[PDB]
Protein backbone atom coordinates (compact mmCIF):
# COMPACT_ATOMS: atom_id res chain seq x y z
CA UNK A 1 0.00 0.00 0.00
CA UNK A 2 1.18 3.58 -1.11
CA UNK A 3 -0.39 6.94 0.26
CA UNK A 4 0.25 10.00 -1.36
CA UNK A 5 -0.39 13.64 0.09
CA UNK A 6 -0.09 17.09 -1.23
CA UNK A 7 -1.04 20.42 -0.29
CA UNK A 8 -1.43 21.61 -3.37
CA UNK A 9 -2.58 25.21 -2.61
CA UNK A 10 -5.24 25.40 -5.17
CA UNK A 11 -5.85 22.25 -7.52
CA UNK A 12 -6.22 24.06 -10.62
CA UNK A 13 -2.71 26.12 -10.10
CA UNK A 14 -1.60 23.28 -9.02
CA UNK A 15 -2.96 20.58 -11.76
CA UNK A 16 -1.23 23.58 -14.24
CA UNK A 17 1.94 23.21 -13.20
CA UNK A 18 1.71 19.50 -13.83
CA UNK A 19 0.92 18.08 -10.72
CA UNK A 20 -1.95 15.15 -12.25
CA UNK A 21 0.26 14.10 -14.56
CA UNK A 22 3.03 13.44 -11.55
CA UNK A 23 0.37 11.78 -9.58
CA UNK A 24 -0.53 9.56 -12.34
CA UNK A 25 2.88 7.60 -12.80
CA UNK A 26 3.52 6.96 -8.83
CA UNK A 27 1.74 3.68 -8.10
CA UNK A 28 -0.28 5.28 -5.39
CA UNK A 29 -3.59 3.53 -4.16
CA UNK A 30 -4.38 6.50 -1.84
CA UNK A 31 -3.81 10.37 -2.85
CA UNK A 32 -5.11 12.89 -0.77
CA UNK A 33 -5.22 16.48 -1.39
CA UNK A 34 -5.40 19.80 0.90
CA UNK A 35 -6.40 23.37 0.24
CA UNK A 36 -8.12 22.54 -3.93
CA UNK A 37 -9.59 26.38 -3.13
CA UNK A 38 -12.51 24.31 -5.57
CA UNK A 39 -16.34 24.25 -5.42
CA UNK A 40 -17.58 20.63 -6.21
CA UNK A 41 -18.67 22.09 -9.71
CA UNK A 42 -14.98 23.03 -10.11
CA UNK A 43 -13.72 19.33 -9.67
CA UNK A 44 -16.40 18.17 -11.96
CA UNK A 45 -13.75 19.38 -14.56
CA UNK A 46 -12.92 16.12 -16.71
CA UNK A 47 -9.55 16.79 -16.39
CA UNK A 48 -8.87 16.59 -12.73
CA UNK A 49 -9.83 13.02 -12.76
CA UNK A 50 -7.37 10.61 -12.75
CA UNK A 51 -7.07 7.07 -14.73
CA UNK A 52 -7.98 4.28 -12.58
CA UNK A 53 -8.88 5.94 -9.41
CA UNK A 54 -12.34 7.09 -7.96
CA UNK A 55 -12.25 10.76 -6.98
CA UNK A 56 -14.23 12.24 -4.09
CA UNK A 57 -13.69 15.91 -2.67
CA UNK A 58 -15.59 18.02 -0.08
CA UNK A 59 -15.51 21.84 -0.81
CA UNK A 60 -15.74 25.26 1.54
CA UNK A 61 -18.76 27.51 1.09
CA UNK A 62 -16.36 29.73 -0.13
CA UNK A 63 -14.38 27.60 -2.27
CA UNK A 64 -10.85 29.10 -2.04
CA UNK A 65 -11.26 29.10 1.79
CA UNK A 66 -10.54 25.10 1.93
CA UNK A 67 -11.84 22.14 0.32
CA UNK A 68 -9.93 18.73 0.07
CA UNK A 69 -10.39 15.74 -2.41
CA UNK A 70 -8.91 12.33 -2.10
CA UNK A 71 -8.42 9.62 -4.99
CA UNK A 72 -8.58 5.97 -4.37
CA UNK A 73 -8.10 3.06 -6.66
CA UNK A 74 -10.87 0.81 -4.67
CA UNK A 75 -14.29 2.09 -3.74
CA UNK A 76 -14.61 3.23 -0.28
CA UNK A 77 -17.14 0.96 1.42
CA UNK A 78 -18.34 4.69 2.69
CA UNK A 79 -16.86 8.13 1.90
CA UNK A 80 -17.70 10.59 5.12
CA UNK A 81 -17.30 14.46 4.91
CA UNK A 82 -16.58 17.05 7.91
CA UNK A 83 -15.80 16.24 11.68
CA UNK A 84 -19.17 18.04 13.22
CA UNK A 85 -17.35 21.29 14.00
CA UNK A 86 -17.34 24.70 12.36
CA UNK A 87 -13.77 25.31 11.54
CA UNK A 88 -14.30 21.97 9.80
CA UNK A 89 -17.34 21.54 8.17
CA UNK A 90 -17.70 25.63 7.06
CA UNK A 91 -14.45 24.98 5.45
CA UNK A 92 -13.91 21.81 3.32
CA UNK A 93 -11.08 20.61 5.66
CA UNK A 94 -12.06 16.83 6.42
CA UNK A 95 -12.78 14.40 4.21
CA UNK A 96 -12.40 10.09 5.42
CA UNK A 97 -12.91 7.53 3.20
CA UNK A 98 -13.28 3.90 4.74
CA UNK A 99 -11.56 0.66 4.05
CA UNK A 100 -11.41 -2.75 5.45
CA UNK A 101 -10.26 -2.51 8.94
CA UNK A 102 -8.62 1.12 8.24
CA UNK A 103 -9.83 4.69 7.41
CA UNK A 104 -8.26 7.24 4.98
CA UNK A 105 -8.90 10.89 5.93
CA UNK A 106 -7.51 13.60 4.34
CA UNK A 107 -7.46 16.64 7.02
CA UNK A 108 -6.87 20.73 6.45
CA UNK A 109 -5.66 22.86 9.26
CA UNK A 110 -5.92 26.65 8.63
CA UNK A 111 -2.22 28.21 8.09
CA UNK A 112 -3.00 30.81 11.24
CA UNK A 113 -0.26 33.02 8.92
CA UNK A 114 -2.11 35.99 8.03
CA UNK A 115 -2.51 37.86 11.31
CA UNK A 116 -4.73 36.88 15.00
CA UNK A 117 -7.83 36.32 13.07
CA UNK A 118 -6.64 33.33 11.95
CA UNK A 119 -4.44 32.09 14.27
CA UNK A 120 -7.77 32.13 16.15
CA UNK A 121 -9.36 30.44 14.07
CA UNK A 122 -5.99 27.93 13.82
CA UNK A 123 -5.95 27.48 18.17
CA UNK A 124 -10.16 26.70 17.80
CA UNK A 125 -9.61 24.26 15.20
CA UNK A 126 -6.89 22.38 17.15
CA UNK A 127 -8.49 22.43 20.63
CA UNK A 128 -11.69 20.10 18.27
CA UNK A 129 -9.51 18.22 16.41
CA UNK A 130 -8.22 17.21 19.98
CA UNK A 131 -11.54 16.96 21.20
CA UNK A 132 -12.28 14.48 18.11
CA UNK A 133 -9.55 12.56 18.55
CA UNK A 134 -9.69 12.05 22.56
CA UNK A 135 -13.21 10.32 21.67
CA UNK A 136 -11.74 8.24 18.62
CA UNK A 137 -9.04 6.37 20.90
CA UNK A 138 -11.77 3.53 22.14
CA UNK A 139 -12.84 2.43 18.15
CA UNK A 140 -11.59 -0.60 17.12
CA UNK A 141 -10.89 0.84 12.99
CA UNK A 142 -7.41 2.16 12.16
CA UNK A 143 -6.68 5.29 10.65
CA UNK A 144 -4.46 7.81 8.95
CA UNK A 145 -4.66 10.93 8.62
CA UNK A 146 -3.33 12.68 5.85
CA UNK A 147 -2.54 15.84 7.65
CA UNK A 148 -1.53 19.52 6.40
CA UNK A 149 -1.29 20.95 10.13
CA UNK A 150 0.89 24.07 9.28
CA UNK A 151 2.91 22.98 12.54
CA UNK A 152 6.04 22.07 13.00
CA UNK A 153 6.48 19.25 15.46
CA UNK A 154 10.18 18.85 16.93
CA UNK A 155 13.36 21.50 16.61
CA UNK A 156 14.65 18.87 13.31
CA UNK A 157 11.64 19.79 11.84
CA UNK A 158 12.14 23.02 10.94
CA UNK A 159 15.31 25.15 9.99
CA UNK A 160 16.96 27.50 11.92
CA UNK A 161 14.65 26.82 14.90
CA UNK A 162 15.33 29.14 16.89
CA UNK A 163 13.79 32.41 14.81
CA UNK A 164 10.60 30.35 14.15
CA UNK A 165 9.56 30.17 17.93
CA UNK A 166 7.75 32.97 17.37
CA UNK A 167 6.25 32.33 14.61
CA UNK A 168 3.00 30.58 13.43
CA UNK A 169 4.01 26.89 12.93
CA UNK A 170 6.30 26.50 15.61
CA UNK A 171 4.69 28.25 18.77
CA UNK A 172 4.81 26.99 22.06
CA UNK A 173 0.90 26.30 21.92
CA UNK A 174 1.49 24.52 18.75
CA UNK A 175 3.78 22.04 19.54
CA UNK A 176 2.41 21.30 22.54
CA UNK A 177 -0.21 20.44 20.55
CA UNK A 178 1.35 17.84 18.76
CA UNK A 179 2.88 16.35 21.63
CA UNK A 180 -0.36 16.29 23.36
CA UNK A 181 -1.31 14.08 20.05
CA UNK A 182 2.02 11.95 19.51
CA UNK A 183 2.41 11.99 23.26
CA UNK A 184 -0.65 10.99 25.91
CA UNK A 185 -3.23 10.13 22.64
CA UNK A 186 -1.09 7.63 21.12
CA UNK A 187 -1.10 8.10 17.55
CA UNK A 188 2.10 8.31 15.58
CA UNK A 189 4.03 9.95 13.22
CA UNK A 190 4.30 7.92 9.79
CA UNK A 191 7.46 9.61 9.14
CA UNK A 192 9.11 9.15 12.12
CA UNK A 193 8.50 5.98 12.61
CA UNK A 194 11.01 4.83 9.80
CA UNK A 195 13.35 8.17 9.77
CA UNK A 196 14.62 9.80 12.65
CA UNK A 197 16.81 12.33 9.93
CA UNK A 198 16.03 16.33 9.86
CA UNK A 199 16.44 18.20 6.86
CA UNK A 200 13.16 16.35 5.93
CA UNK A 201 10.53 19.61 5.40
CA UNK A 202 7.08 19.64 3.30
CA UNK A 203 7.08 23.43 3.17
CA UNK A 204 9.13 26.38 2.10
CA UNK A 205 7.92 30.07 1.78
CA UNK A 206 7.78 30.73 -2.18
CA UNK A 207 10.79 32.94 -2.30
CA UNK A 208 14.16 32.34 -4.44
CA UNK A 209 16.49 32.12 -1.13
CA UNK A 210 14.71 29.53 0.56
CA UNK A 211 15.38 26.71 -2.14
CA UNK A 212 18.76 27.23 -1.95
CA UNK A 213 19.22 27.51 1.75
CA UNK A 214 16.53 24.79 2.48
CA UNK A 215 14.65 27.26 4.82
CA UNK A 216 11.82 24.86 5.40
CA UNK A 217 9.76 23.79 7.61
CA UNK A 218 7.53 20.20 8.07
CA UNK A 219 3.48 21.04 8.13
CA UNK A 220 2.48 17.82 6.25
CA UNK A 221 1.70 13.86 8.29
CA UNK A 222 0.25 11.13 7.97
CA UNK A 223 -0.78 10.62 11.76
CA UNK A 224 -1.64 7.02 12.16
CA UNK A 225 -3.75 5.12 15.22
CA UNK A 226 -0.95 2.85 17.09
CA UNK A 227 -2.60 -0.32 15.27
CA UNK A 228 -0.39 0.88 12.05
CA UNK A 229 2.72 2.33 13.57
CA UNK A 230 5.05 -1.23 12.54
CA UNK A 231 3.18 -1.23 9.16
CA UNK A 232 5.16 1.91 7.86
CA UNK A 233 8.04 0.93 5.31
CA UNK A 234 9.29 3.65 3.53
CA UNK A 235 8.56 7.85 3.96
CA UNK A 236 9.77 10.24 1.77
CA UNK A 237 9.40 14.32 1.17
CA UNK A 238 11.00 15.26 -2.20
CA UNK A 239 12.60 18.33 -3.07
CA UNK A 240 11.59 17.90 -6.63
CA UNK A 241 9.02 17.42 -8.21
CA UNK A 242 6.68 20.29 -7.21
CA UNK A 243 3.67 22.02 -7.18
CA UNK A 244 3.15 24.29 -4.46
CA UNK A 245 4.33 25.22 -1.51
CA UNK A 246 4.43 21.92 0.18
CA UNK A 247 6.46 18.92 -0.51
CA UNK A 248 4.53 15.69 -1.61
CA UNK A 249 4.46 13.16 1.26
CA UNK A 250 4.55 9.53 0.11
CA UNK A 251 4.44 6.47 2.41
CA UNK A 252 4.61 2.99 1.57
CA UNK A 253 2.89 0.54 4.22
CA UNK A 254 2.60 -3.58 4.48
CA UNK A 255 -0.80 -3.72 4.41
CA UNK A 256 -2.77 -4.88 1.91
CA UNK A 257 -5.91 -2.40 1.15
CA UNK A 258 -9.44 -4.02 1.08
CA UNK A 259 -12.64 -3.72 0.73
Known amino acids: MRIISVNVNGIQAAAERGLLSWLQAQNADVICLQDTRASAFDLDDPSFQLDGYFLYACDAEL ?86 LYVAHQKMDVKNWRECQQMPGFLAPERAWLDEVFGNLGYADALREVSREGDQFSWWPDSEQAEMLNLGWRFDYQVLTPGLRRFVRNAKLPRQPRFSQHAPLIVDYDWQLSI
Do not use: W
Open 63 to 148: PEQGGVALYSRLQPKAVISGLGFETADRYGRYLQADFDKVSIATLLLPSGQSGDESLNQKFKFMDDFTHYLSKQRRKRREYIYCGS
